[PDB]
Symmetry: C4
Subunit: 195 residues, 4 copies
C-alpha cells in the first residue's frame, strides 16, 4: 500500500478527466450575455451557483497533474529494448470504460446537492473497486491521446521472457517488434517502438 495504491489511484484520476470536462460543459450556469444591461452579478452568487463546475475543475487539474506524473516515468529511464512474442490489442477495454462508467453521469441531473453527494460516493466506490481489479490500465484520456493499450509478452535478451504484460504505446505494435520500456508497475509499461 501507499506506493502501488497511490500509483493506481493516480492512474484512475487520469481516467476520469473526460467526465470532469463533461460535467463542466453540462451544468455550468454561466450568464452568457452580450448586452449593455447584463452587468456582473458578483463573485459570491457566481461561485455559489457553480459549485460542481468548481469541484470538477479542481479534479480536472488533479487529472492534469497525474498525467504529468505519468509522463515523468518515461522522462528518466528507458534505454533498453525487448522483443514482443505475442501482441493482442486491448484498446477496446478503454472504450467500454466510456461506455459504462462515465455516460450514466451524463444521464443524471446535478440539481439537488444530496444527489450530488450520492454521485460523488458512486465515483469513490467505483474507484475503490477499480483499484484492485487488474484492469486499471483502461483509460479514455490516455487512449484519446494517440496511445494504444496492448497485451504483450516481452522477451529479454539476457533474463528471459515474462508473460502477460500491458503496453501503453504511441504507435502500432506487432509480433516480433522492438520496443523500449519504462515500467510503471509490474503490469503496465510504456513502449516506444525502436525503428
Amino acid at each position: 500500500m501507499q506506493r502501488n495504491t497511490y500509483n493506481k489511484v493516480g492512474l484512475y484520476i487520469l481516467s476520469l478527466a473526460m467526465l470532469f470536462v463533461f460535467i463542466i460543459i453540462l451544468t455550468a450556469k454561466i450568464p452568457f450575455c452580450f448586452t449593455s444591461d447584463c452587468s456582473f452579478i458578483g463573485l459570491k452568487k457566481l461561485v455559489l451557483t457553480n459549485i460542481v463546475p468548481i469541484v470538477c475543475f479542481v479534479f480536472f487539474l488533479f487529472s492534469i497533474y497525474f498525467y504529468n506524473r505519468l509522463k515523468n516515468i518515461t522522462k528518466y529511464n528507458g534505454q533498453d529494448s525487448v522483443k514482443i512474442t505475442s501482441c493482442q490489442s486491448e484498446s477496446y477495454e478503454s472504450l467500454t470504460f466510456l461506455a459504462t462508467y462515465i455516460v450514466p453521469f451524463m444521464g443524471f441531473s446535478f440539481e439537488d446537492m444530496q444527489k450530488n453527494i450520492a454521485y460523488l460516493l458512486l465515483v469513490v466506490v467505483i474507484g475503490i473497486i477499480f483499484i484492485k481489479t487488474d484492469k486499471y490500465y483502461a483509460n479514455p484520456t490516455l487512449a484519446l491521446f494517440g496511445f494504444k493499450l496492448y497485451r504483450v509478452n516481452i522477451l529479454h535478451p539476457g533474463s528471459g521472457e515474462t508473460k502477460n504484460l500491458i503496453a501503453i504505446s504511441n504507435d502500432v505494435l506487432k509480433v516480433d517488434d522492438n520496443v523500449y520500456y519504462s515500467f510503471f508497475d509490474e503490469f503496465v509499461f510504456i513502449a516506444r517502438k525502436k525503428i
Copy 2:
C-alpha cells in the same frame, strides 16, 4: 433447492448493499434545517414521507446480517491447505455488476409509488435470474472490503485436483501458492494465504 438457494440468496442480498445505501442517500427528504423556523413536524408524517429509505434501511440490515452469516463460514473448521495451479484474476466481476445492475437504479426517480413497485419487481427478477446463472460470486460489498475473486484450480495432497473453483481471497494469490480454505458452497470457497 432451499438450503443452496438460501445460501445463494444470502450472497445476492449482500451484493446489493451499495444500492441500498445509494437509495438512502439519494431520496431521503429529511428536514435538515439550520434555521430556527423549521421545528419537528412530527414522527408520523416523517415516517410517511420517508418510505423507500426505510425499506432500504431494513434491506441494509438484511445485507449486514448476511455478511455476518458469510463470516460464520470461516469462523468454523478451515484448517486444511491446498496448492494453486491456476490463478486467473476474475475480479473484474463486481465492477460490471456495479455499473450494470446498481448504477441504472440511481438514475430512476423514486417519486410515484407504481414506479417503486416496478423497481422492486426489477430487483426481484434480477435476483431470480442471478441465483441460477453460475456468476453469483460477483459482489461489490465483498470487493469493497479488500476481497479479490479469483478463478482457481486447486490440488489436494491426498484426493487429487479439482477444476474451476472460485476463491474469495483476502490477499493476492499466484501460481504455486498455499491457501487455507473454507467451502461456502461447491463452487465458492473463502481462502486465506498461508505465510
Copy 3:
C-alpha cells in the same frame, strides 16, 4: 427465410415479456379511488389515457402465445437420447440481455407519443439485428422459469459428434449425462435429463 425467421421472431417476442410487464406496471395511470367522489369517467377515457398499457398488454398475450408455441415442441418427438461430452454454462447471456436491453427502457418517460414511436422503433430495430445475431437464445422469460441455457456437444450412438449446440434444460447438466433432445432449430434444443 420465413419459417426459421418466424421461429427466431417468436423467440425474441418471448424474450421481451418482462419488458411488457414492466411497462404495464410503470405507466398505467389507473384511477384507483376508494373515495365516494371518484366515479367512473367512462371506458373511452380509460382506454384513451392507457394506450401504451393496452399495446403492451396485446404484446404480452403475444409473448404468452409464443411461449405456448415453444412448449409445443417438447410434446411430439422426444423418445431419443444423446450424451453430452462438454458442457459450459452460458446462462449469463440471459442476464446480460435483461440488464442491457430491458433496463434502459424502464428509465424512459412514456408520456409524449413521439417518444413512444421512437421507443417502438428501437424495439423493432433491436429485434431485426437480434434475429440474425447468433445469440438469439438469450431469454429473461425462459430463464425465469427454471430453464438454464448450456453450450453442449452431443454424442449420438450412431450418427456422430455434432458440436456447438445450445441446450435449454430444466435441470443441471454436466459431462457424461444422457439427455432427451427436441430440436427447435439447428442450434437450440430442449434437454430433459434422462435419469
Copy 4:
C-alpha cells in the same frame, strides 16, 4: 493517417445512422395538427425551433454518402476467390454497439443547448477513441441491411493463408465456403459467397 483514418471515420459515421434517425423522431417539434386554424407560423421559427433535427438530418445524409462509398468499394474489383478455414460469427459485436452507445443517448433530454454541446462532444470523443479501437467494424446500420460480420481466416490458392480477417457479408458462411473479396482495409473485406 489521413486516408485510413478517413475510411475508419466514414465507417463510424455509417455506424451512427440509427442514432440520427432516433433523434429526428424524438425531438422534432413539428406542429402535426390537422386543425383549420393551424396556419404556417413561418419558415424561420420552424427552422429555429428544430435545430437538432436539422443537424441530425445533415449527419444522416453524411451516413448515406458513406454507405454509398462503402458500396463503391465493392463495385469495381472482386473477381478472385479464397477458401475459409475458421469461421466464427461476430454479429453480436454489432449489437453491443447499439445497446451501450446509441441506446443511452435517447434517455437524455435535448432541450437546453449546453447539454447538446456536451452530447456532441461525447459523440466526437467516442468517435476519436473508436477509430483506433480495433473493433471499428461494429455496425447497426450494416447489420440492419442483412450483412453479417464474421471472423474468418482465408486461404489464397497461390500466396498462402492470412489470419484474423473480418468479413462483412450478405449470406451465411461456414468452413470451405469460397468467397470473393473486395478488401476495404487490411482487416475488413466484403464477401460474396461464390456458389
